[PDB]
Amino acid sequence: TRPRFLELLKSECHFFNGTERVRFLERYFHNQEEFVRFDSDVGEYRAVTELGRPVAESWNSQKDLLEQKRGQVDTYCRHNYGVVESFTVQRRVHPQVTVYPAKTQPLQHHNLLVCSVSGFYPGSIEVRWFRNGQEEKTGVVSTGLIHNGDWTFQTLVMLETVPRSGEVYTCQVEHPSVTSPLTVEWRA
Amino acid sequence: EEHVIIQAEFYLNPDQSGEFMFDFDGDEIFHVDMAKKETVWRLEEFGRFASFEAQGALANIAVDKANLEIMTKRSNYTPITNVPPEVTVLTNSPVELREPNVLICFIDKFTPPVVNVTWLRNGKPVTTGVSETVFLPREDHLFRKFHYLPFLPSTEDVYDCRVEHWGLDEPLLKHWEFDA
Protein backbone atom coordinates (compact mmCIF):
# COMPACT_ATOMS: atom_id res chain seq x y z
CA THR A 1 0.00 0.00 0.00
CA ARG A 2 1.79 3.10 1.34
CA PRO A 3 5.64 3.43 1.68
CA ARG A 4 7.16 1.55 4.64
CA PHE A 5 10.11 2.43 6.88
CA LEU A 6 12.01 -0.30 8.75
CA GLU A 7 14.56 -0.04 11.51
CA LEU A 8 16.63 -3.09 12.34
CA LEU A 9 18.99 -3.86 15.23
CA LYS A 10 21.17 -6.97 15.57
CA SER A 11 23.48 -7.75 18.48
CA GLU A 12 25.66 -10.68 17.48
CA CYS A 13 27.86 -12.91 19.53
CA HIS A 14 30.22 -15.18 17.61
CA PHE A 15 31.94 -17.98 19.49
CA PHE A 16 35.02 -19.94 18.38
CA ASN A 17 36.04 -22.97 20.48
CA GLY A 18 33.47 -22.40 23.21
CA THR A 19 34.01 -19.03 24.84
CA GLU A 20 37.76 -19.09 24.27
CA ARG A 21 37.41 -16.60 21.41
CA VAL A 22 34.35 -14.35 21.35
CA ARG A 23 33.32 -11.53 19.05
CA PHE A 24 30.57 -8.96 19.75
CA LEU A 25 28.83 -6.91 17.06
CA GLU A 26 26.08 -4.32 17.47
CA ARG A 27 24.63 -3.42 14.05
CA TYR A 28 22.08 -0.69 13.12
CA PHE A 29 20.05 -0.92 9.89
CA HIS A 30 17.57 1.33 8.16
CA ASN A 31 15.49 -0.05 5.29
CA GLN A 32 17.91 -2.96 4.84
CA GLU A 33 20.91 -0.61 4.97
CA GLU A 34 23.48 -0.99 7.76
CA PHE A 35 24.70 2.53 8.55
CA VAL A 36 26.68 2.16 11.78
CA ARG A 37 28.08 -0.61 14.00
CA PHE A 38 30.21 -1.55 17.01
CA ASP A 39 32.62 -4.47 16.57
CA SER A 40 34.45 -5.73 19.64
CA ASP A 41 37.51 -6.23 17.40
CA VAL A 42 37.75 -2.46 16.96
CA GLY A 43 36.39 -1.17 20.25
CA GLU A 44 34.52 1.83 18.86
CA TYR A 45 31.71 2.57 16.44
CA ARG A 46 32.44 2.78 12.71
CA ALA A 47 30.12 4.24 10.10
CA VAL A 48 29.14 1.78 7.38
CA THR A 49 27.56 4.47 5.20
CA GLU A 50 27.32 8.27 4.96
CA LEU A 51 24.29 8.30 7.26
CA GLY A 52 26.37 6.71 10.00
CA ARG A 53 29.30 9.15 10.07
CA PRO A 54 27.66 11.76 12.33
CA VAL A 55 26.34 8.91 14.50
CA ALA A 56 29.72 7.22 14.93
CA GLU A 57 31.31 10.60 15.82
CA SER A 58 28.73 11.42 18.47
CA TRP A 59 28.82 7.96 20.07
CA ASN A 60 32.58 7.63 19.95
CA SER A 61 33.05 10.87 21.90
CA GLN A 62 31.18 9.23 24.81
CA LYS A 63 33.88 7.04 26.36
CA ASP A 64 31.57 5.76 29.10
CA LEU A 65 29.38 4.28 26.37
CA LEU A 66 32.35 2.72 24.58
CA GLU A 67 33.60 1.13 27.82
CA GLN A 68 30.29 -0.60 28.43
CA LYS A 69 30.22 -1.89 24.85
CA ARG A 70 33.81 -3.14 25.21
CA GLY A 71 32.66 -5.33 28.08
CA GLN A 72 29.77 -7.05 26.29
CA VAL A 73 31.91 -9.97 25.03
CA ASP A 74 32.17 -10.81 28.74
CA THR A 75 29.00 -9.59 30.43
CA TYR A 76 26.70 -10.27 27.48
CA CYS A 77 28.08 -12.84 25.04
CA ARG A 78 29.98 -15.16 27.40
CA HIS A 79 27.32 -14.63 30.00
CA ASN A 80 24.47 -15.75 27.73
CA TYR A 81 26.44 -18.69 26.30
CA GLY A 82 26.76 -19.93 29.87
CA VAL A 83 22.99 -19.75 30.34
CA VAL A 84 21.76 -21.48 27.15
CA GLU A 85 24.78 -23.76 26.64
CA SER A 86 23.10 -26.85 28.10
CA PHE A 87 20.04 -26.85 25.88
CA THR A 88 21.45 -25.34 22.67
CA VAL A 89 25.16 -26.11 22.16
CA GLN A 90 24.76 -29.52 23.86
CA ARG A 91 21.38 -30.32 22.26
CA ARG A 92 21.32 -33.58 20.33
CA VAL A 93 18.49 -35.43 18.66
CA HIS A 94 19.10 -38.69 16.77
CA PRO A 95 17.93 -38.77 13.15
CA GLN A 96 15.13 -41.05 11.95
CA VAL A 97 16.17 -42.81 8.75
CA THR A 98 14.04 -44.46 6.05
CA VAL A 99 14.83 -45.70 2.55
CA TYR A 100 12.09 -45.93 -0.10
CA PRO A 101 11.64 -45.94 -3.91
CA ALA A 102 10.36 -42.83 -5.74
CA LYS A 103 9.70 -41.79 -9.35
CA THR A 104 11.29 -38.89 -11.24
CA GLN A 105 8.35 -39.33 -13.61
CA PRO A 106 4.87 -40.62 -12.60
CA LEU A 107 4.89 -42.18 -16.07
CA GLN A 108 7.23 -45.18 -15.74
CA HIS A 109 8.35 -47.02 -12.60
CA HIS A 110 10.62 -46.29 -9.63
CA ASN A 111 14.10 -45.13 -10.69
CA LEU A 112 15.05 -43.19 -7.57
CA LEU A 113 16.05 -44.46 -4.12
CA VAL A 114 15.40 -41.93 -1.35
CA CYS A 115 17.29 -41.86 1.90
CA SER A 116 15.20 -39.72 4.24
CA VAL A 117 16.87 -38.40 7.41
CA SER A 118 14.66 -36.36 9.71
CA GLY A 119 14.00 -34.81 13.10
CA PHE A 120 17.70 -34.38 13.93
CA TYR A 121 19.86 -31.74 15.64
CA PRO A 122 22.33 -30.04 15.17
CA GLY A 123 22.12 -29.53 11.42
CA SER A 124 25.58 -30.92 10.68
CA ILE A 125 25.17 -34.26 8.92
CA GLU A 126 26.72 -36.50 6.30
CA VAL A 127 24.86 -38.99 4.10
CA ARG A 128 26.45 -41.39 1.63
CA TRP A 129 24.97 -43.99 -0.70
CA PHE A 130 26.46 -47.43 -1.28
CA ARG A 131 25.64 -50.02 -3.95
CA ASN A 132 26.72 -53.60 -3.27
CA GLY A 133 29.21 -52.20 -0.76
CA GLN A 134 30.72 -49.54 -3.04
CA GLU A 135 30.05 -45.83 -2.50
CA GLU A 136 28.14 -44.21 -5.35
CA LYS A 137 28.57 -40.47 -6.01
CA THR A 138 27.80 -39.53 -9.61
CA GLY A 139 24.10 -40.28 -9.39
CA VAL A 140 23.36 -38.60 -6.09
CA VAL A 141 21.00 -35.65 -5.81
CA SER A 142 19.64 -34.00 -2.67
CA THR A 143 17.34 -31.36 -1.24
CA GLY A 144 20.36 -30.17 0.70
CA LEU A 145 20.05 -29.39 4.43
CA ILE A 146 16.50 -28.33 5.34
CA HIS A 147 15.64 -26.44 8.50
CA ASN A 148 12.13 -27.14 9.90
CA GLY A 149 12.16 -23.99 12.09
CA ASP A 150 11.56 -25.96 15.28
CA TRP A 151 15.06 -27.02 16.36
CA THR A 152 15.07 -30.01 13.99
CA PHE A 153 16.40 -30.57 10.49
CA GLN A 154 15.89 -33.05 7.69
CA THR A 155 17.38 -33.94 4.31
CA LEU A 156 16.57 -36.20 1.37
CA VAL A 157 19.53 -37.74 -0.40
CA MET A 158 18.32 -39.51 -3.51
CA LEU A 159 20.18 -42.10 -5.58
CA GLU A 160 19.31 -42.08 -9.29
CA THR A 161 19.31 -45.79 -10.03
CA VAL A 162 17.28 -48.53 -11.67
CA PRO A 163 17.23 -51.43 -9.17
CA ARG A 164 17.85 -54.94 -10.48
CA SER A 165 17.08 -58.18 -8.67
CA GLY A 166 19.93 -59.08 -6.33
CA GLU A 167 21.36 -55.61 -5.78
CA VAL A 168 21.84 -54.30 -2.28
CA TYR A 169 21.80 -50.58 -1.48
CA THR A 170 22.97 -48.90 1.68
CA CYS A 171 22.31 -45.44 3.06
CA GLN A 172 24.95 -44.29 5.59
CA VAL A 173 24.27 -41.44 8.02
CA GLU A 174 26.96 -39.74 10.11
CA HIS A 175 25.79 -37.26 12.75
CA PRO A 176 26.97 -35.77 16.11
CA SER A 177 24.13 -37.51 17.95
CA VAL A 178 25.84 -40.88 17.43
CA THR A 179 29.41 -42.14 17.83
CA SER A 180 29.06 -44.64 14.99
CA PRO A 181 27.64 -44.29 11.48
CA LEU A 182 24.00 -45.33 11.11
CA THR A 183 23.03 -47.52 8.15
CA VAL A 184 19.85 -48.67 6.47
CA GLU A 185 20.01 -51.29 3.76
CA TRP A 186 17.51 -51.81 0.93
CA ARG A 187 17.46 -54.93 -1.26
CA ALA A 188 15.97 -55.23 -4.73
CA GLU B 1 32.67 -19.77 14.11
CA GLU B 2 31.37 -22.71 16.13
CA HIS B 3 28.23 -20.90 17.30
CA VAL B 4 26.37 -17.62 16.94
CA ILE B 5 23.70 -15.98 19.10
CA ILE B 6 21.81 -13.08 17.60
CA GLN B 7 19.47 -10.70 19.40
CA ALA B 8 17.25 -9.32 16.63
CA GLU B 9 14.68 -6.60 16.92
CA PHE B 10 12.93 -4.29 14.49
CA TYR B 11 10.25 -1.66 14.18
CA LEU B 12 8.20 -0.78 11.14
CA ASN B 13 6.09 2.26 10.13
CA PRO B 14 3.35 3.08 9.33
CA ASP B 15 2.34 -0.44 10.44
CA GLN B 16 3.68 0.37 13.90
CA SER B 17 4.73 -3.27 14.35
CA GLY B 18 7.85 -4.43 16.17
CA GLU B 19 9.45 -7.73 17.21
CA PHE B 20 12.21 -8.86 19.57
CA MET B 21 13.79 -12.33 19.50
CA PHE B 22 16.94 -14.31 20.18
CA ASP B 23 18.32 -16.66 17.53
CA PHE B 24 20.86 -19.45 18.05
CA ASP B 25 22.52 -20.92 14.96
CA GLY B 26 19.40 -20.09 12.88
CA ASP B 27 16.80 -21.27 15.39
CA GLU B 28 14.68 -19.20 17.73
CA ILE B 29 15.24 -19.48 21.48
CA PHE B 30 12.36 -17.13 22.33
CA HIS B 31 10.57 -13.94 21.40
CA VAL B 32 8.72 -11.33 23.39
CA ASP B 33 4.99 -10.80 23.04
CA MET B 34 4.80 -7.01 23.21
CA ALA B 35 1.10 -6.74 24.08
CA LYS B 36 1.40 -9.23 26.93
CA LYS B 37 4.95 -8.39 28.02
CA GLU B 38 5.65 -12.12 28.16
CA THR B 39 8.63 -14.21 27.14
CA VAL B 40 7.59 -16.88 24.62
CA TRP B 41 10.09 -19.72 24.35
CA ARG B 42 10.18 -21.59 21.02
CA LEU B 43 10.29 -24.90 22.88
CA GLU B 44 8.24 -25.24 26.08
CA GLU B 45 11.06 -26.96 27.94
CA PHE B 46 13.32 -23.90 27.55
CA GLY B 47 11.39 -21.92 30.15
CA ARG B 48 12.66 -24.35 32.77
CA PHE B 49 16.29 -23.94 31.78
CA ALA B 50 16.45 -20.13 31.62
CA SER B 51 14.52 -16.88 32.04
CA PHE B 52 14.40 -13.42 30.44
CA GLU B 53 12.85 -10.17 31.69
CA ALA B 54 10.43 -9.30 28.88
CA GLN B 55 10.26 -5.73 30.20
CA GLY B 56 13.73 -5.14 28.77
CA ALA B 57 12.58 -5.85 25.20
CA LEU B 58 9.88 -3.16 25.48
CA ALA B 59 12.54 -0.68 26.51
CA ASN B 60 14.64 -1.75 23.48
CA ILE B 61 11.75 -1.37 21.01
CA ALA B 62 11.13 2.15 22.35
CA VAL B 63 14.71 3.04 21.39
CA ASP B 64 14.52 1.35 17.98
CA LYS B 65 11.33 3.30 17.14
CA ALA B 66 12.94 6.56 18.23
CA ASN B 67 15.92 5.73 15.97
CA LEU B 68 13.60 4.97 13.07
CA GLU B 69 11.92 8.37 13.46
CA ILE B 70 15.27 10.12 13.22
CA MET B 71 16.79 8.00 10.45
CA THR B 72 13.63 8.26 8.34
CA LYS B 73 14.12 12.03 8.47
CA ARG B 74 17.89 12.05 7.83
CA SER B 75 17.52 9.65 4.93
CA ASN B 76 15.14 12.12 3.24
CA TYR B 77 12.22 9.68 3.59
CA THR B 78 13.42 7.12 1.02
CA PRO B 79 11.07 4.09 1.31
CA ILE B 80 12.26 0.52 1.70
CA THR B 81 12.39 -1.51 -1.49
CA ASN B 82 10.06 -4.50 -1.50
CA VAL B 83 11.74 -7.85 -1.95
CA PRO B 84 9.36 -10.74 -2.86
CA PRO B 85 9.50 -14.01 -0.84
CA GLU B 86 10.44 -17.50 -1.97
CA VAL B 87 7.92 -20.07 -0.73
CA THR B 88 8.49 -23.76 -0.06
CA VAL B 89 5.98 -26.32 1.20
CA LEU B 90 7.12 -29.70 2.51
CA THR B 91 6.13 -32.23 5.18
CA ASN B 92 7.77 -32.76 8.57
CA SER B 93 8.65 -36.31 7.42
CA PRO B 94 7.82 -38.97 4.77
CA VAL B 95 4.08 -39.17 4.24
CA GLU B 96 1.99 -42.25 4.99
CA LEU B 97 -1.76 -42.69 4.66
CA ARG B 98 -3.66 -42.21 7.92
CA GLU B 99 -0.46 -41.38 9.80
CA PRO B 100 -0.33 -37.93 11.47
CA ASN B 101 2.14 -35.60 9.79
CA VAL B 102 2.77 -31.87 9.48
CA LEU B 103 2.83 -29.52 6.51
CA ILE B 104 5.37 -26.69 6.63
CA CYS B 105 5.26 -23.51 4.60
CA PHE B 106 8.66 -21.86 4.56
CA ILE B 107 8.67 -18.20 3.50
CA ASP B 108 12.20 -16.88 3.00
CA LYS B 109 14.26 -13.95 1.66
CA PHE B 110 11.77 -11.08 1.89
CA THR B 111 11.22 -7.60 3.37
CA PRO B 112 9.38 -5.72 4.89
CA PRO B 113 8.37 -8.30 7.52
CA VAL B 114 4.67 -8.26 6.58
CA VAL B 115 2.82 -11.12 4.91
CA ASN B 116 -0.65 -12.70 4.69
CA VAL B 117 -0.44 -16.48 4.86
CA THR B 118 -3.32 -18.92 4.48
CA TRP B 119 -3.41 -22.71 4.48
CA LEU B 120 -5.86 -24.00 1.84
CA ARG B 121 -7.17 -27.57 1.62
CA ASN B 122 -8.88 -28.49 -1.64
CA GLY B 123 -9.20 -24.76 -2.14
CA LYS B 124 -10.91 -23.96 1.16
CA PRO B 125 -9.15 -22.15 4.07
CA VAL B 126 -8.17 -24.29 7.06
CA THR B 127 -7.13 -23.10 10.53
CA THR B 128 -7.35 -26.29 12.55
CA GLY B 129 -4.20 -26.48 14.65
CA VAL B 130 -2.22 -24.07 12.45
CA SER B 131 0.78 -22.43 14.09
CA GLU B 132 3.53 -20.06 13.02
CA THR B 133 6.84 -18.50 14.03
CA VAL B 134 7.69 -14.81 14.25
CA PHE B 135 9.87 -13.20 11.57
CA LEU B 136 13.35 -14.73 11.78
CA PRO B 137 16.69 -13.12 10.77
CA ARG B 138 19.03 -13.96 7.89
CA GLU B 139 22.69 -12.95 7.27
CA ASP B 140 21.62 -10.95 4.23
CA HIS B 141 19.29 -9.09 6.59
CA LEU B 142 16.10 -10.26 4.89
CA PHE B 143 13.52 -12.31 6.77
CA ARG B 144 12.37 -15.94 7.19
CA LYS B 145 9.12 -17.30 8.55
CA PHE B 146 7.51 -20.69 9.12
CA HIS B 147 3.86 -21.81 9.12
CA TYR B 148 2.69 -25.24 10.24
CA LEU B 149 -0.38 -27.35 9.65
CA PRO B 150 -0.77 -30.79 11.22
CA PHE B 151 -2.76 -33.04 8.88
CA LEU B 152 -3.76 -36.66 8.21
CA PRO B 153 -2.35 -37.78 4.80
CA SER B 154 -4.90 -38.88 2.25
CA THR B 155 -5.27 -39.29 -1.49
CA GLU B 156 -8.44 -37.23 -1.14
CA ASP B 157 -6.79 -34.06 0.21
CA VAL B 158 -4.92 -31.38 -1.73
CA TYR B 159 -3.13 -28.50 0.00
CA ASP B 160 -1.79 -25.04 -0.89
CA CYS B 161 0.07 -22.34 1.05
CA ARG B 162 -1.17 -18.97 -0.16
CA VAL B 163 1.24 -16.09 0.47
CA GLU B 164 0.73 -12.37 -0.11
CA HIS B 165 3.56 -9.81 -0.09
CA TRP B 166 3.75 -6.20 -1.31
CA GLY B 167 6.67 -7.20 -3.48
CA LEU B 168 4.50 -9.78 -5.22
CA ASP B 169 2.33 -8.94 -8.24
CA GLU B 170 -0.20 -11.66 -7.37
CA PRO B 171 -0.96 -14.09 -4.52
CA LEU B 172 1.67 -16.84 -4.52
CA LEU B 173 0.47 -20.40 -3.98
CA LYS B 174 2.47 -23.56 -3.38
CA HIS B 175 0.80 -26.90 -4.03
CA TRP B 176 1.22 -30.22 -2.23
CA GLU B 177 -0.43 -33.61 -2.83
CA PHE B 178 0.11 -37.10 -1.43
CA ASP B 179 2.36 -39.21 -3.67
CA ALA B 180 0.40 -42.40 -4.43
Partner: peptide
Amino acid sequence: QHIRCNIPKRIGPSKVATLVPR
Protein backbone atom coordinates in the same frame (compact mmCIF):
# COMPACT_ATOMS: atom_id res chain seq x y z
CA GLN C 1 20.05 -18.80 34.39
CA HIS C 2 19.19 -15.25 33.32
CA ILE C 3 19.58 -14.19 29.67
CA ARG C 4 20.72 -10.57 29.39
CA CYS C 5 19.76 -8.21 26.57
CA ASN C 6 22.05 -5.73 24.85
CA ILE C 7 20.70 -2.17 24.92
CA PRO C 8 20.85 -0.04 21.73
CA LYS C 9 21.88 3.63 21.77
CA ARG C 10 19.56 6.50 20.79
CA ILE C 11 20.85 8.31 17.71
CA GLY C 12 19.40 11.57 18.97
CA PRO C 13 17.49 13.30 21.77
CA SER C 14 14.37 13.97 19.65
CA LYS C 15 11.21 12.52 21.21
CA VAL C 16 9.01 13.48 18.24
CA ALA C 17 6.92 10.99 16.27
CA THR C 18 5.83 12.03 12.79
CA LEU C 19 3.35 10.39 10.42
CA VAL C 20 5.44 8.82 7.64
CA PRO C 21 4.91 10.15 4.06
CA ARG C 22 1.98 8.85 2.00
